[PDB]
Write a protein that binds this ligand. Structure first.
Ligand SMILES: [Ca+2]
Length: 686
């Protein structure tokens, strides 16, 4: 016992069109509306201000007075999503969307979801695989690739795949993971209220004037297994059609749980009235989650070996501030040690994914405590988790997606059981029934939310408090060097990977985003903790060297930021041409074993200079330290960080040096053990 194999039943529930900051932008301990490493626009304001001939900012939807649970969905086409992305700038959020997409909810509107988040594990770095519509994301979730072949050509980007119910009438013909599950011999099933032709336009997309209330019989064509040739043309009495595509119910799920005959792996699909789609409120999705939870938790033996994973397909047009890792798509935009075959759209040329943030909640006896996990995951991580548990490896996973995204084994603590019960409120259906009842009956008639009448006087804050967080394998180095001969900027990016209890040795892949504050274009890098054998016989990995030639101005001015995973910040400023003929310092880092930090300052110049280190006042109260460093000199300093929860933000300045010269270092020391969240989140952003 005590391993991943102890898990026996796995349930996957997948809702629609809810971004991260829309739900948990206020929750304490998450990288929410007050991320201190927020992206900065060209004008110098943080990205929380968006310019569309006027200044737009996020605002709090207050269901107690308006109808925020009934808002029409926005436009989230592929072109719209990529124009939002803007090749890493992420600043045209209001260019294509509409103002109402900037709203966010609070605990007063969704008590059930916030109770779940406070009680169960939440991922704040979960990204959608394709920056596009629903079906391709669900195609990735059910197959692991949205193309007939893994060469990057003919990848579906619009929407054709379907079952001829709500306008989607296509058929795709590559190997699907449930087929591998059937071939292997693992019991799998799909829970939905109806099969073929259950959903109807006449029922759901005509405002449903006859009912407009509830439909517990259809499935909204969200079954991605039904779009494949083998399934769509399987024998009517065949095993595949029995296991996958039929009519079932959540009451039958409760019956199966109480009979100790739960299918090993269950895809739970939702009816349209409950699947969180913007035509319907989050309260209905809460009620369905309550039904699933009370059905599942109705037995000790079943709950002692069950893992329930709730996630969403895409974030729709709802606002999210982070910028997702992406693979290089042309020249002059960075290099990756791992071959990006099949990850780049051939016709368009821009990369497919990954995309913005969507919530992921893990409910299991091994996933309590209200923890927050900073590793980056995509839809393929679920299939990789099934691979890790059952051993059936899906080859359809693109190599870049295999390297970048994790396998969800870092969320759960399998060294124990923790088989305790769950709070009575979340399993108590009738109060959630009351919430659904007065949500439909009251918030229906309230006026709709605007932005021209509910403009915010300030950017939204965050709930007070920290949360314990889970260890991540990312430890990074980013050093800058100036070529005194060629006058170029050389960036050394490095990774090692942290050993984990869930990761036997510590394979990991990190993505770096380099943001030009003044001039240039964002440049992305992918490094890995293991060697990668390139097609030419080389051995890439563990270290990358790049040259930032195009960032320089006409007079040598350079000013840029280096981002990453888990709040890795390195801000570099200065100038080059005049810097040649006097001294210059350089800053290097070393992660001590016991969670402390070591800072080394290296001088190769010609005259002595004084260098002062002044930490941010929030983390610690000891004073700045200054050293008079000579030419060809170096000194090392040990910085204690246990009282700051193992986070650092240092500003290194110097005298007798160039103007505008300033170095900024910031991040979290990774040691392989769970720790707390960032203390700086609850400090007001502006
Ligand atoms: Ca969707």
């Amino acid at each position: 016992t005590g391993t991943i194999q102890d898990v026996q039943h796995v349930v996957i529930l997948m809702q629609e069109n809810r971004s991260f900051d829309h739900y948990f932008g206020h929750l304490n301990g998450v990288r929410g509306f007050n991320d201190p490493r927020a992206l900065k626009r060209q004008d110098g304001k943080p990205v929380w201000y968006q310019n569309y001939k006027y200044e737009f900012s996020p605002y709090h939807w207050d269901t107690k007075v308006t109808s925020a649970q009934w808002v029409s969905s926005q436009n989230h086409e592929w072109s719209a999503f990529h124009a939002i992305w803007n090749q890493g700038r992420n600043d045209k959020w209001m260019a294509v969307q509409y103002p109402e997409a900037m709203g966010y909810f609070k605990r007063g509107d969704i008590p059930y979801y916030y109770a779940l988040a406070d009680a169960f594990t939440l991922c704040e770095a979960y990204h959608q695989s394709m920056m596009g519509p629903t079906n391709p994301n669900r195609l990735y979730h059910m197959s692991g690739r949205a193309a007939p072949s893994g060469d990057g050509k003919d990848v579906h980007i619009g929407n054709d795949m379907g079952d001829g119910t709500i306008g989607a009438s296509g058929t795709v013909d590559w190997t699907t993971y449930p087929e591998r599950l059937s071939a292997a011999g693992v019991d799998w099933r799909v829970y939905q209220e109806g099969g073929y032709r259950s959903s109807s336009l006449w029922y759901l997309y005509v405002d449903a004037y006859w009912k407009y209330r509830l439909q517990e019989q259809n499935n909204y064509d969200c079954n991605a297994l039904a779009w494949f040739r083998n399934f769509k043309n399987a024998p009517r009495d065949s095993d595949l059609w029995q296991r996958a595509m039929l009519a079932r119910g959540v009451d039958q799920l409760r019956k199966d749980v109480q009979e100790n005959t739960l299918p090993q792996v269950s895809w739970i699909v939702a009816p349209y009235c409950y699947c969180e789609h913007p035509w319907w409120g989050p309260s209905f999705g809460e009620y369905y989650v309550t039904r699933v939870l009370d059905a599942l938790t109705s037995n000790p033996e079943v709950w002692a070996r069950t893992v329930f994973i709730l996630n969403y397909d895409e974030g729709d047009g709802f606002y999210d501030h982070a910028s997702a890792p992406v693979p290089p798509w042309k020249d002059g935009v960075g290099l990756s040690t791992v071959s990006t075959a099949g990850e780049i759209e051939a016709s368009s040329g821009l990369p497919i994914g990954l995309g913005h943030r969507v919530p992921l909640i893990a409910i299991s006896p091994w996933s309590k405590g209200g923890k927050v996990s900073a590793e980056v995951f995509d839809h393929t991580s679920v299939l990789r988790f099934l691979e890790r548990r059952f051993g059936v490896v899906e080859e359809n996973i693109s190599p870049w997606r295999r390297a970048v995204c994790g396998d969800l084994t870092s969320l759960f603590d399998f060294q124990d059981a923790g088989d305790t019960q769950v709070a009575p409120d979340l399993t108590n259906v009738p109060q959630s029934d009351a919430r659904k009842e007065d949500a439909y009956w009251q918030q229906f008639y309230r006026p709709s939310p605007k932005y021209w009448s509910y403009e915010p006087k300030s950017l939204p804050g965050q709930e007070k408090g920290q949360r314990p967080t889970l260890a991540v394998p990312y430890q990074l180095h980013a050093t800058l060097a100036l070529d005194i001969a060629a006058g170029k900027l050389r960036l050394t990016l490095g990774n090692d990977g942290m050993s984990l209890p869930g990761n036997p040795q510590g394979h990991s892949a990190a993505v770096f985003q380099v943001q030009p504050r003044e001039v240039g274009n964002p440049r992305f890098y992918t490094v890995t903790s293991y060697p990668v054998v390139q097609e030419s016989g080389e051995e890439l990995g563990r270290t990358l060297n790049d040259e930032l030639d195009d960032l320089l101005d006409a007079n040598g001015r350079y000013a840029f930021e280096v981002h990453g995973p888990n709040g890795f910040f390195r801000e570099f400023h200065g100038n080059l041409h005049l810097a040649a003929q006097m001294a210059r310092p350089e800053v290097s880092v070393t992660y001590q074993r016991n969670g402390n930090l070591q800072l080394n300052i290296r001088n190769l110049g010609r005259l002595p200079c004084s260098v002062t280190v002044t930490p941010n006042p929030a983390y610690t109260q000891e004073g700045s330290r200054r050293y008079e460093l000579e030419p060809n000199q170096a000194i090392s300093e040990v910085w204690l960080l246990r009282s700051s929860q193992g986070w650092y933000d240092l500003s290194v300045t110097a005298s007798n040096t160039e103007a505008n010269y300033l170095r900024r270092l910031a991040g979290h020391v990774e040691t392989g053990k769970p720790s707390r969240s960032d203390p700086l989140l609850d400090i007001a952003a502006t």
